[PDB]
């Protein structure tokens, strides 16, 4: 399963209040939060397993953070007292930092992988406004319910890799652009 190798690694802050690794990725790059280079001298381990480089960050103190921007992940961590309980999973095989692709995967309904995928999708949806080519309907605030764009624009976001989800419903395009880094 996708969540087979998920493990928890409990760490503390170092001097300068850092983690001994940098957070990369985030929804703004269309990615899972993931660990930069984990160097031995700098991670203040407490308990659980060890962190390696490139691991996908899933949860901080039971708060799911996959699907969020780096900025939001940093914000969860800052409102968490030590020690930080990190649920992570190594990249490799079908486990990858690419959020677009992860959201295309199709797991069994009822599966832990499916449950998790839905949590990650909702996180993504909390930080983004979808875009569509269908006309503004009454009741809708442009830029909140939907960024209303032309097909040429949708096609251009598409080709540029700006979209994490996309598709047509009734002769019109619908997608989710990457949130901005803030």
């Amino acid at each position: 399963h996708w969540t087979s190798k998920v493990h928890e690694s409990v760490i503390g802050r170092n001097p300068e209040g850092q983690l001994g690794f940098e957070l990369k990725g985030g929804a703004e790059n269309g990615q899972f939060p993931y660990l930069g280079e984990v160097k031995p001298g700098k991670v203040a381990y407490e308990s659980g397993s060890k962190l390696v480089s490139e691991e996908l960050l899933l949860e901080v103190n039971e708060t799911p953070v996959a699907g969020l921007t780096i900025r939001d992940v940093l914000a969860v961590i800052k409102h968490c007292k030590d020690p930080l309980r990190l649920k992570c999973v190594k990249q490799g095989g079908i486990v990858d930092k690419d959020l677009r692709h992860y959201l295309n995967l199709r797991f069994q309904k009822g599966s832990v992988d499916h449950e998790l995928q839905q949590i990650i999708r909702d996180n993504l949806y909390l930080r983004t406004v979808p875009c569509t080519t269908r006309p503004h309907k009454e009741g809708e605030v442009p830029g909140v319910d939907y960024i209303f764009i032309t097909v040429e624009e949708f096609m251009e976001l598409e080709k540029s890799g700006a979209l994490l989800e996309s598709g047509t419903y009734e002769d019109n395009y619908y997608g989710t652009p990457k949130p901005p880094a803030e």
Binding site: Y125, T132, E165, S166, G167, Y169, E170, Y173, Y174
Partner: peptide
């Protein structure tokens, strides 16, 4: 949350 039109377009049924 996202509307049915968006999900019918972006998610496999």
């Amino acid at each position: 949350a996202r509307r049915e039109s968006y999900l019918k377009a972006t998610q496999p049924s």
